[PDB]
Amino acid sequence: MNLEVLCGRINVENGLSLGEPGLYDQIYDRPGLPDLDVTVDATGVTVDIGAVPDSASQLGSSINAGLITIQLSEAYKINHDFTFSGLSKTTDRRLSEVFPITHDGSDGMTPDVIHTRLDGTIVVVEFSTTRSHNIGGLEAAYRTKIEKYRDPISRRVDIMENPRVFFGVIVVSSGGVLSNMPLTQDEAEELMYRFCIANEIYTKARSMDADIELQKSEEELEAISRALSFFSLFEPNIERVEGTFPNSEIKMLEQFLSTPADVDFITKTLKAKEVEAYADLCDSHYLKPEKTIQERLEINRCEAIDKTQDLLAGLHARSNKQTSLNRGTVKLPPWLPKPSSGAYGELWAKCLLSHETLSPFLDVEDIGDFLTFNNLLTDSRYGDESIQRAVSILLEKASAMQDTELTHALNDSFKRNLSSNVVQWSLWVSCLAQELASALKQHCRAGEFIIKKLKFWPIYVIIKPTKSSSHIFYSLGIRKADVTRRLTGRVFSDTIDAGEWELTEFKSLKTCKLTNLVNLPCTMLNSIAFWREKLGVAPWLVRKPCSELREQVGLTFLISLEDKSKTEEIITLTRYTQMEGFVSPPMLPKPQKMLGKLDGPLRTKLQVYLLRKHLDCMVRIASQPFSLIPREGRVEWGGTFHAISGRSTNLENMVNSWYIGYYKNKEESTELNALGEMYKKIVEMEEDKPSSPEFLGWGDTDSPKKHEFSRSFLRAACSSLEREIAQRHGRQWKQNLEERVLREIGTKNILDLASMKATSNFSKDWELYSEVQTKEYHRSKLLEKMATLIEKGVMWYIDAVGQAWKAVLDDGCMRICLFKKNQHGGLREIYVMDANARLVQFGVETMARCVCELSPHETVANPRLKNSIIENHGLKSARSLGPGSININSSNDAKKWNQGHYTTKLALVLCWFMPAKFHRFIWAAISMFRRKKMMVDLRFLAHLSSDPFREAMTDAFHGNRDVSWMDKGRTYIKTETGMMQGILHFTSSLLHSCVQSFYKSYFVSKLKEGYMGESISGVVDVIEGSDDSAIMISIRPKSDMDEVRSRFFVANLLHSVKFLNPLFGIYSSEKSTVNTVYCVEYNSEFHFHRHLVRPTLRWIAASHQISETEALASRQEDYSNLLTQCLEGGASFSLTYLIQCAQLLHHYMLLGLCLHPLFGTFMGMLISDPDPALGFFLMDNPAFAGGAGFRFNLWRACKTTDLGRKYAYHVVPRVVAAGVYLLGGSLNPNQERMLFPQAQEYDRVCTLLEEVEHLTGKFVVRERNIVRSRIDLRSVRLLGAPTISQVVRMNFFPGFSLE
Ligand SMILES: [Mg+2]
């Protein structure tokens, strides 16, 4: 290459400059590494490098073949020298000659390249290297190299007249190249290729002489010698293991490594599991004898009608067959007063002074119209009364730091959503649910009634708590003359009448549904402000509800008031029904596969409505797909529609329709229904153990039997990943690995163990039920298990293991406990281990995380990749195919990941990537999992002692019918199979990559031989994390009629994955689209060829969590962090502000806005002093509304107002009761620099935003495609079309240009 043209790319204007850091990743495919013969002698290093095999990529021409030498004086820096040989115009020009001398000590320092231009501009070029695989080091070395010369260069140039100097740095590794100097990609790829062969030789010769590494650390050396003496003196009694834990025999491992793989048995099976597939495509897609594409969609249409009628019938046969019912979906009455400031009649007067399932035909027409015409969004009159005036006061004060026109234009829109009536209704509910939750735990005198009058409103309550503290009974009454308006619907509860009063019927409410009634008024203002932007209206206009909006704010109001699972489930299951329809011609959409998961017993008048609307979406899709329209160079899809209420919309409007019931929680709800379910999902495949340990690691099979695998494959899918590691990194990857592990286990201290981690107090004592009762459990933390350890003289982690392994072998189990939150799907179960077992399991993680971290696909240890595989597939395919090449991908799933994996094959698949000293250890840390014992709640055991699977448990108890997973009398549940969730998180993801690299090498060898004997041309990519995956195949067909035969051929390859999986022990699911064209979907982000769609509504709903923190002003660093999550999810700068004002209303309502009798004081107090840590809410700036964090806002208020001078020196109750109980006139630029470190940078921002303070713009349309793009200032990524003045102008509202 050349070094002068490269310097001729950069242009500096005046003063000093650095540029912008840019990263090039390894994208293009390199060739094989050349033969290396290295011989170190007394004279020096003798090197022999052969001739690299040729590539069509044309890399490796730079390195020249032959024999050379390096002097032993310069062997310690071979890596820095061999790589940059060409750019090494070694002239050794000092800085004292070309620059002034100001006595800064840098005069002697000589950069590696100095280039002087004719005009006078100078470029300062550097060169560096790194050996780490973490992209933190690639930035660390760059930043320290910057600091190496930042100060003296400035000190010298400030004296200079007519100044122009640039600092240019390069950092190269085999991971990625980070540079601030523009290059072509190829010129970074060759740098990486050369670094490979440099480091390989440095390692090879490093072994012979110890003085070469004339460095390292005096302390680091101690750690390696500390953690090397353990793995040679540790000794677990083998013959005592094989007797205790059922299937652990050290002979099985010594036969896995040594015996080779049976190739005469592999090539036969792949030929029988193939013709299975091709004889199943033609049977279920109607390909024989021959039929036009128009006739086949007519056979498919009539098969989808049969299956749905046999489902509706069987659900009718067992049901109290009726066609009428008087009920209400909203158990609360419709009332709407004006905020101010028959034994039931006598009962009120006194204190004043089933189990059957409905039928799928029920005449649900009440609900069918409340969605079209409803009185929910008509502005009620009294938008100026007590409660709304008390909020207008606390919004002006916080918004005084800015006073521009954007603010008065966005605070007069929010004050228009707070006045509609669906919010004015929701404010007197969410105040009632703060009384019921308050007096939930209180005193009971048999026959007690408590009376309470709601403030702000003329409504009365009557509580009556029971001893269960899991129920409560109320009833409300009003004067019948104050009820002015009502909410105009027939889905409501019917109120008893009195001549002068109106009452209700003493209903009852649980106590898990009270965190959901308090977050009501805040999740409405977010659902009005999200669906008025997607449709097209603007915040500063007025309109009429366009009747595509009544249904979405109407439907959200119903699912969130009937709080049940199994009704928020027939919606989220509409995602795999509609996602079929993107499927390509040689196949047909088949959404009938979702029957099953759709046969449950209905129990309301809503789940009947959502079920009939869902089936007619299955019939319409099965009859025609979403059609393709390739107008521009881009592609578009036509015919999309909403699911529930048939409509027509675009993509983003559909993709967000899924995710209508999502919401998160962490409260660990307890109810006998929920807990009884978890134990059902744990013991499912326990009675299906094969009971003949010959196919669990000893031999081969063809037809596995639901827990088994074939060993001859696990050797052929491990040794196919090992090649792909040996080429990206250099050969001899093993020793270097051994170093990383040892230093990592050695230096781990006992003073830094993750505390606050819960553990389990389960032992022999808690084993018989009768004798242990009325005796609470109360599991404890981990901080106290570090106590008794330091009290015996142990400060290094690797010394507390030896006592922790014997404390298990003398017991015989794991002693686990259980814990479960309530959020309707996600990660709802948590498995807690005792303390003697977290120590033996900490070791097998650092041993197994350092091997994932050097793999190309796997995306859970190296997070950077998730993005860079699917975007960099276009370019890599274009280069070796030439434009005009199609894309045919898929996206998969696994059904039972845990509960389905034997715990061998996770110990055999790891012991292959290990250096033969640890084999005795890990094979003994695993095989601790083949006998477990899990607790069962006590309240669960009580009710059971005195229909499906519950009549089996109480049967297994009491000494009746024998079962294997439980025992008689004892309080626990045995098990002998399967990993658990979150315990073996990292070794199990390593077994996924050993598989996916078996396909990527199986498909590639199949494309190489065509069907007639030709050869297709293609490019195969694979990516996969813990459970998901994807595959992407691109081809280039020469002529027509070969585009038709080469697309039928691929369709099988992606289809036959379903049959080849059970040979490794993985079971494919029925939620895995197959053979889509131009669209893929990896984790939750859908890539529609050129448009990236990301579901926003998921992050808007999970934006106001009950803040469980002690000191105020530590809440606001959460609140202001659940905000930058949404903005990166794709949301305007004008909406992200209207989501902020809703956090405010939530905040002050926790300090007691409508619960406490004295709030004028705490309201009149904060107006005088506005500091946080007393309870003031610092608001953002209208534009740039979620970019800069909390600091920026604390600093933009630190230099304007009173804060300056002062700075010159249940769950709902205890969040409130801790809340209200705790209640020179400037700064010199030297102390501010101490406090706010970048206070010199913020002003580069604060001066730009004061240019756009006025509301003026137009309407445009541009580029119709979106792309993730990185912004730097803190770093935040904003979704936008392909600076700060440009982003702030485009992202204020879609289709609008500010200023
Ligand atoms: Mg998936």
Side-chain angles (χ1 to χ4, degrees):
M1 301 307 297
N2 286 163
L3 172 50
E4 72 296 339
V5 53
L6 262 283
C7 318
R9 295 292 88 197
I10 193 77
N11 185 359
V12 71
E13 280 56 71
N14 215 307
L16 292 204
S17 311
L18 176 50
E20 288 135 308
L23 213 160
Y24 308 67
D25 58 338
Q26 207 298 325
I27 36 194
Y28 296 122
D29 61 356
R30 349 157 156 192
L33 310 190
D35 308 65
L36 257 45
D37 293 319
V38 177
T39 321
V40 66
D41 266 298
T43 59
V45 197
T46 88
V47 178
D48 177 46
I49 299 186
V52 169
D54 287 32
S55 168
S57 175
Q58 312 118 313
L59 285 199
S61 45
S62 277
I63 190 178
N64 313 77
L67 193 159
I68 72 150
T69 176
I70 292 196
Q71 292 224 40
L72 220 65
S73 42
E74 55 211 23
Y76 93 115
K77 274 289 256 174
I78 166 173
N79 260 336
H80 188 295
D81 294 338
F82 193 107
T83 320
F84 300 109
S85 86
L87 279 54
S88 278
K89 304 214 151 53
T90 53
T91 42
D92 293 7
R93 290 187 44 166
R94 302 91 177 164
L95 295 182
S96 170
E97 61 205 349
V98 176
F99 261 46
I101 294 169
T102 318
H103 285 255
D104 44 35
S106 178
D107 289 345
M109 294 300 293
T110 299
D112 283 87
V113 152
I114 281 303
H115 212 62
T116 44
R117 313 212 310 180
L118 294 161
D119 54 338
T121 43
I122 321 293
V123 308
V124 180
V125 186
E126 286 250 20
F127 309 94
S128 318
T129 43
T130 66
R131 300 182 90 224
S132 88
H133 306 142
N134 189 310
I135 313 312
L138 254 67
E139 168 278 351
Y142 180 99
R143 285 254 192 217
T144 304
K145 201 71 82 152
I146 293 310
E147 190 88 326
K148 218 183 195 275
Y149 285 104
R150 177 261 203 173
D151 320 68
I153 283 195
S154 92
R155 280 201 279 272
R156 300 158 84 136
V157 183
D158 53 58
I159 297 314
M160 292 177 72
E161 196 250 348
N162 220 56
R164 281 145 291 102
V165 167
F166 211 105
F167 209 71
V169 194
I170 318 299
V171 175
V172 167
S173 154
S174 207
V177 188
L178 186 159
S179 73
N180 88 262
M181 170 181 305
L183 267 62
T184 296
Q185 182 77 192
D186 211 290
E187 274 128 16
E189 313 258 6
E190 200 63 15
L191 274 185
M192 281 168 289
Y193 195 114
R194 292 185 80 89
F195 180 97
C196 162
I197 304 168
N199 190 58
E200 184 185 335
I201 280 169
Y202 172 48
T203 59
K204 287 215 61 160
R206 180 209 50 179
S207 68
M208 285 144 190
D209 177 300
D211 284 29
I212 69 180
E213 56 142 0
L214 181 67
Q215 263 194 16
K216 225 43 48 198
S217 168
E218 63 165 80
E219 310 167 18
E220 160 197 335
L221 188 40
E222 306 176 10
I224 295 185
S225 177
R226 176 177 308 157
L228 177 60
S229 43
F230 179 79
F231 287 138
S232 303
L233 320 171
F234 174 77
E235 167 80 352
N237 186 349
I238 280 312
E239 57 269 4
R240 194 144 91 109
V241 160
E242 305 190 10
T244 59
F245 300 113
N247 209 308
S248 150
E249 307 199 21
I250 207 68
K251 184 149 63 80
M252 179 187 319
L253 180 40
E254 289 176 1
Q255 289 183 342
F256 179 80
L257 308 199
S258 56
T259 39
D262 196 319
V263 81
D264 63 61
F265 158 81
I266 273 184
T267 55
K268 278 190 173 177
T269 280
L270 297 188
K271 197 43 184 183
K273 295 283 194 168
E274 190 286 328
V275 312
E276 249 191 21
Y278 172 57
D280 177 276
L281 196 71
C282 301
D283 281 329
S284 178
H285 284 3
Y286 323 102
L287 274 71
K288 278 203 166 186
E290 170 265 358
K291 283 161 190 171
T292 189
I293 175 60
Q294 184 41 54
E295 305 175 10
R296 318 210 311 248
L297 283 165
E298 256 295 332
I299 309 185
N300 193 353
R301 187 208 205 286
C302 319
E303 166 184 325
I305 298 193
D306 303 6
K307 311 207 166 179
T308 65
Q309 272 181 347
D310 304 358
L311 162 68
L312 284 178
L315 250 174
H316 184 16
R318 28 199 175 84
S319 36
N320 50 352
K321 319 170 179 52
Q322 294 183 12
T323 299
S324 159
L325 182 52
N326 183 285
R327 233 176 177 177
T329 312
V330 168
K331 303 291 182 192
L332 289 127
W335 286 332
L336 260 175
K338 187 168 66 63
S340 83
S341 295
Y344 281 68
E346 314 309 346
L347 162 37
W348 243 93
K350 186 251 185 180
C351 266
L352 181 59
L353 57 91
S354 78
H355 71 86
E356 289 169 10
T357 83
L358 324 182
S359 84
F361 320 98
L362 203 76
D363 177 66
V364 296
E365 307 278 25
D366 185 352
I367 307 180
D369 89 322
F370 173 83
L371 298 193
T372 74
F373 328 105
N374 66 59
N375 173 31
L376 282 172
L377 289 149
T378 73
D379 162 277
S380 87
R381 285 287 93 79
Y382 34 91
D384 160 76
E385 291 292 341
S386 274
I387 177 163
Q388 195 184 348
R389 188 214 325 273
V391 193
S392 178
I393 286 177
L394 279 150
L395 188 41
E396 308 173 349
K397 321 319 290 182
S399 178
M401 297 140 58
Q402 57 260 349
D403 62 80
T404 59
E405 199 37 60
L406 282 191
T407 292
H408 293 258
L410 291 186
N411 285 8
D412 276 28
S413 181
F414 169 81
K415 264 209 277 290
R416 203 172 316 163
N417 291 341
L418 179 48
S419 158
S420 49
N421 37 27
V422 69
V423 175
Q424 290 296 150
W425 190 80
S426 279
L427 276 194
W428 66 263
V429 160
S430 178
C431 164
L432 177 63
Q434 294 198 273
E435 303 284 354
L436 303 190
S438 152
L440 188 72
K441 210 87 76 64
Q442 211 159 256
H443 59 284
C444 190
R445 37 169 173 86
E448 60 171 17
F449 291 152
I450 309 183
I451 319 296
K452 285 189 180 179
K453 189 242 184 191
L454 302 184
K455 58 195 301 186
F456 288 143
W457 290 286
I459 288 180
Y460 300 78
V461 175
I462 288 199
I463 321 189
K464 173 201 154 185
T466 85
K467 293 195 224 63
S468 64
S469 276
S470 321
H471 276 78
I472 197 157
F473 291 76
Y474 59 95
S475 96
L476 322 171
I478 210 183
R479 198 145 263 172
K480 197 180 179 176
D482 312 279
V483 170
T484 68
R485 322 178 193 276
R486 297 159 95 89
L487 241 133
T488 300
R490 294 155 59 190
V491 282
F492 280 107
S493 151
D494 41 356
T495 43
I496 288 182
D497 303 31
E500 187 176 19
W501 287 54
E502 258 188 358
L503 328 171
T504 52
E505 300 131 355
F506 251 75
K507 317 242 185 183
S508 100
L509 187 57
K510 277 205 184 313
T511 189
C512 324
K513 339 284 190 41
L514 286 184
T515 302
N516 184 30
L517 250 55
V518 184
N519 305 135
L520 198 49
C522 318
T523 179
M524 274 311 170
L525 304 155
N526 295 175
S527 191
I528 302 182
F530 180 74
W531 292 110
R532 287 180 73 260
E533 183 178 2
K534 234 65 187 180
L535 298 195
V537 202
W540 59 88
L541 310 189
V542 175
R543 203 78 95 68
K544 214 174 181 177
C546 84
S547 160
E548 203 185 275
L549 198 142
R550 282 157 158 149
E551 318 169 344
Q552 314 279 183
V553 189
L555 177 51
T556 303
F557 176 75
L558 276 178
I559 297 174
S560 147
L561 262 204
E562 178 170 12
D563 184 1
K564 288 189 181 310
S565 179
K566 219 263 169 188
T567 165
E568 312 174 358
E569 195 281 329
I570 319 157
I571 302 143
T572 77
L573 219 65
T574 203
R575 168 183 158 191
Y576 326 89
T577 281
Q578 277 207 63
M579 195 84 186
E580 312 262 7
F582 294 107
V583 176
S584 178
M587 287 194 165
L588 306 177
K590 257 177 173 37
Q592 327 137 350
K593 61 191 213 306
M594 273 300 136
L595 300 166
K597 306 160 166 305
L598 270 193
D599 61 356
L602 324 175
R603 283 187 186 78
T604 189
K605 284 192 72 179
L606 193 61
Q607 327 179 15
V608 168
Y609 180 71
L610 298 183
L611 179 52
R612 304 292 295 280
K613 288 279 196 167
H614 185 342
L615 292 187
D616 289 345
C617 183
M618 287 177 40
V619 187
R620 190 201 308 202
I621 294 169
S623 154
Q624 68 165 31
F626 299 143
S627 90
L628 208 60
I629 294 178
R631 42 166 85 112
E632 199 34 64
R634 47 179 156 91
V635 175
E636 283 289 20
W637 281 271
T640 70
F641 60 103
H642 285 244
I644 295 292
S645 75
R647 273 281 166 183
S648 286
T649 39
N650 40 335
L651 271 167
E652 39 191 28
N653 278 305
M654 182 174 77
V655 164
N656 294 286
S657 157
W658 330 325
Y659 314 101
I660 258 195
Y662 248 73
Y663 84 122
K664 296 178 191 179
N665 257 0
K666 298 191 313 305
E667 301 177 10
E668 190 225 351
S669 291
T670 282
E671 179 41 35
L672 269 79
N673 299 129
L675 318 176
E677 174 272 359
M678 159 163 34
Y679 314 128
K680 185 179 189 170
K681 206 172 183 175
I682 273 182
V683 175
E684 258 192 343
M685 317 182 55
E686 180 43 38
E687 57 275 10
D688 293 5
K689 221 184 48 187
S691 77
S692 313
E694 194 209 338
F695 292 147
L696 311 184
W698 285 102
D700 325 13
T701 70
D702 184 304
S703 73
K705 292 272 191 181
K706 222 181 304 183
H707 260 264
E708 314 178 334
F709 53 92
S710 76
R711 174 194 58 94
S712 151
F713 272 90
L714 265 191
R715 260 195 63 106
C718 287
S719 96
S720 274
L721 169 65
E722 171 179 301
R723 285 159 198 157
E724 292 184 19
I725 302 193
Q727 297 210 21
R728 173 119 149 191
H729 309 260
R731 64 181 192 86
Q732 285 212 334
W733 47 280
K734 237 171 174 177
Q735 327 166 12
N736 309 293
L737 207 182
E738 166 183 332
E739 306 306 1
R740 193 183 184 279
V741 168
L742 281 174
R743 169 218 314 158
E744 189 49 281
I745 307 181
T747 178
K748 186 61 182 176
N749 181 8
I750 210 178
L751 197 38
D752 67 335
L753 283 198
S755 179
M756 318 295 297
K757 256 188 172 289
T759 43
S760 56
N761 301 310
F762 181 62
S763 57
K764 285 280 180 58
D765 317 325
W766 304 83
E767 203 143 294
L768 295 174
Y769 181 79
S770 169
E771 42 97 346
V772 175
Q773 64 180 187
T774 57
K775 184 181 167 189
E776 313 304 87
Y777 199 102
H778 296 199
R779 65 185 164 268
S780 44
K781 305 288 183 186
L782 181 58
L783 172 56
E784 63 81 26
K785 192 42 162 55
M786 286 171 285
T788 299
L789 262 302
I790 75 153
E791 206 208 296
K792 300 171 189 175
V794 289
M795 324 167 198
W796 310 101
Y797 162 78
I798 205 171
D799 293 7
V801 154
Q803 303 164 352
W805 164 241
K806 268 181 184 174
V808 152
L809 201 39
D810 293 342
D811 221 9
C813 34
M814 287 257 302
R815 312 281 180 176
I816 306 175
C817 189
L818 307 180
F819 170 95
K820 172 174 171 184
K821 31 191 155 143
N822 63 330
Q823 38 178 349
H824 296 335
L827 329 168
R828 296 180 309 159
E829 289 88 311
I830 302 189
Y831 293 22
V832 282
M833 269 185 302
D834 57 337
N836 282 275
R838 275 186 179 269
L839 290 193
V840 175
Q841 294 294 349
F842 198 110
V844 175
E845 297 311 84
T846 74
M847 218 164 311
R849 181 227 297 168
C850 301
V851 193
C852 273
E853 213 153 41
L854 56 94
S855 172
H857 341 294
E858 150 65 17
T859 171
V860 82
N862 9 349
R864 148 197 45 108
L865 295 174
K866 198 188 312 177
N867 325 317
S868 280
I869 304 269
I870 314 183
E871 287 75 304
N872 295 10
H873 185 67
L875 303 48
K876 167 189 172 186
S877 86
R879 198 199 194 199
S880 43
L881 293 178
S885 40
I886 294 169
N887 191 313
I888 328 171
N889 30 43
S890 178
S891 46
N892 325 350
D893 267 356
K895 42 198 315 169
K896 310 153 185 157
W897 198 239
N898 358 331
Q899 329 157 40
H901 264 301
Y902 211 49
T903 299
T904 323
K905 112 188 183 194
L906 304 193
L908 290 173
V909 63
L910 181 46
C911 291
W912 185 286
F913 313 105
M914 271 321 157
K917 310 153 185 43
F918 314 74
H919 283 193
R920 265 166 48 193
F921 178 59
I922 61 171
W923 172 272
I926 321 184
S927 100
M928 192 177 77
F929 284 97
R930 322 228 198 86
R931 189 172 296 166
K932 321 175 197 165
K933 298 181 181 188
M934 321 195 193
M935 265 286 282
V936 183
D937 184 297
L938 300 186
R939 312 209 158 188
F940 186 80
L941 284 166
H943 289 215
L944 168 150
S945 204
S946 87
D947 317 322
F949 169 72
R950 228 177 245 179
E951 320 274 21
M953 187 174 306
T954 172
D955 188 337
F957 221 164
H958 296 291
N960 254 21
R961 173 180 74 107
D962 182 14
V963 187
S964 91
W965 40 269
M966 195 168 188
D967 210 333
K968 151 71 175 307
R970 314 205 176 299
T971 304
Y972 57 66
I973 297 171
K974 280 178 291 181
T975 301
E976 190 219 325
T977 172
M979 69 183 77
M980 293 134 42
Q981 196 169 3
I983 311 301
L984 278 193
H985 179 207
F986 268 115
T987 189
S988 178
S989 179
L990 177 51
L991 162 65
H992 215 343
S993 315
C994 300
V995 168
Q996 295 278 71
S997 303
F998 182 43
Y999 302 144
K1000 172 175 181 176
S1001 162
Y1002 164 56
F1003 294 165
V1004 153
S1005 151
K1006 209 97 175 184
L1007 295 171
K1008 176 173 290 298
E1009 63 185 342
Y1011 50 112
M1012 319 195 176
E1014 321 89 323
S1015 49
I1016 294 169
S1017 75
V1019 162
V1020 188
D1021 260 11
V1022 177
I1023 186 167
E1024 33 84 10
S1026 154
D1027 206 330
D1028 264 274
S1029 64
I1031 297 185
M1032 288 166 273
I1033 306 184
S1034 295
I1035 52 179
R1036 212 262 198 279
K1038 312 162 304 301
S1039 87
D1040 182 18
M1041 175 177 37
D1042 263 7
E1043 182 172 353
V1044 169
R1045 202 151 312 279
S1046 291
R1047 200 180 312 196
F1048 179 91
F1049 179 67
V1050 162
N1052 298 328
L1053 297 189
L1054 285 155
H1055 188 110
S1056 93
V1057 160
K1058 178 187 180 65
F1059 294 103
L1060 289 167
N1061 267 1
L1063 300 176
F1064 309 90
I1066 310 175
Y1067 307 120
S1068 273
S1069 200
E1070 49 159 15
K1071 310 168 160 195
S1072 72
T1073 317
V1074 156
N1075 200 233
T1076 37
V1077 168
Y1078 280 122
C1079 72
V1080 63
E1081 180 272 273
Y1082 169 72
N1083 209 337
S1084 91
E1085 329 152 342
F1086 314 72
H1087 297 75
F1088 292 115
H1089 175 252
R1090 187 45 46 80
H1091 182 36
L1092 187 104
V1093 183
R1094 187 187 295 254
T1096 281
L1097 194 43
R1098 181 154 59 95
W1099 286 299
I1100 284 196
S1103 167
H1104 43 220
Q1105 315 265 52
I1106 293 277
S1107 39
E1108 191 72 339
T1109 60
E1110 41 211 291
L1112 312 184
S1114 164
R1115 304 181 175 175
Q1116 305 197 23
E1117 301 150 303
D1118 306 359
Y1119 272 161
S1120 299
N1121 190 285
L1122 308 173
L1123 201 39
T1124 65
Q1125 274 186 358
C1126 159
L1127 171 58
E1128 310 175 29
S1132 295
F1133 281 121
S1134 178
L1135 161 64
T1136 311
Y1137 181 71
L1138 289 175
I1139 282 181
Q1140 166 123 327
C1141 302
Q1143 290 186 7
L1144 191 136
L1145 177 61
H1146 178 231
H1147 180 272
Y1148 291 121
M1149 210 161 63
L1150 295 174
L1151 310 190
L1153 166 59
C1154 50
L1155 181 65
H1156 217 41
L1158 62 80
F1159 198 62
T1161 88
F1162 298 98
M1163 172 183 151
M1165 165 189 301
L1166 295 174
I1167 297 187
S1168 277
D1169 73 88
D1171 196 54
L1174 299 192
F1176 207 55
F1177 203 75
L1178 252 62
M1179 206 92 66
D1180 286 83
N1181 190 290
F1184 214 63
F1190 186 35
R1191 293 289 232 86
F1192 194 111
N1193 273 306
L1194 197 43
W1195 167 89
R1196 192 179 51 108
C1198 162
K1199 328 165 304 101
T1200 290
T1201 178
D1202 289 345
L1203 203 60
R1205 301 117 190 170
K1206 180 173 184 171
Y1207 248 53
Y1209 293 55
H1210 215 55
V1211 182
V1212 181
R1214 29 188 187 85
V1215 154
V1216 175
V1220 63
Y1221 145 81
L1222 308 181
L1223 300 201
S1226 91
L1227 285 85
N1228 64 34
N1230 222 327
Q1231 186 173 355
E1232 320 198 330
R1233 213 279 316 155
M1234 192 155 187
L1235 206 44
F1236 304 96
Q1238 279 141 339
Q1240 306 110 16
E1241 180 37 73
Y1242 296 156
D1243 274 32
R1244 279 159 198 156
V1245 158
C1246 180
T1247 58
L1248 282 151
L1249 305 169
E1250 58 80 30
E1251 194 95 40
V1252 305
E1253 69 295 343
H1254 267 264
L1255 178 55
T1256 59
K1258 337 189 65 55
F1259 280 87
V1260 294
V1261 298
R1262 265 204 260 114
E1263 276 268 85
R1264 322 299 286 191
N1265 74 79
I1266 294 169
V1267 175
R1268 204 161 180 79
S1269 206
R1270 332 288 174 183
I1271 297 306
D1272 217 319
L1273 64 139
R1274 189 188 198 92
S1275 45
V1276 170
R1277 300 138 280 270
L1278 305 193
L1279 258 182
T1283 46
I1284 286 192
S1285 182
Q1286 192 67 3
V1287 154
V1288 173
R1289 266 184 51 243
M1290 282 322 102
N1291 282 43
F1292 188 78
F1293 196 88
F1296 184 87
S1297 170
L1298 188 68
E1299 190 256 15

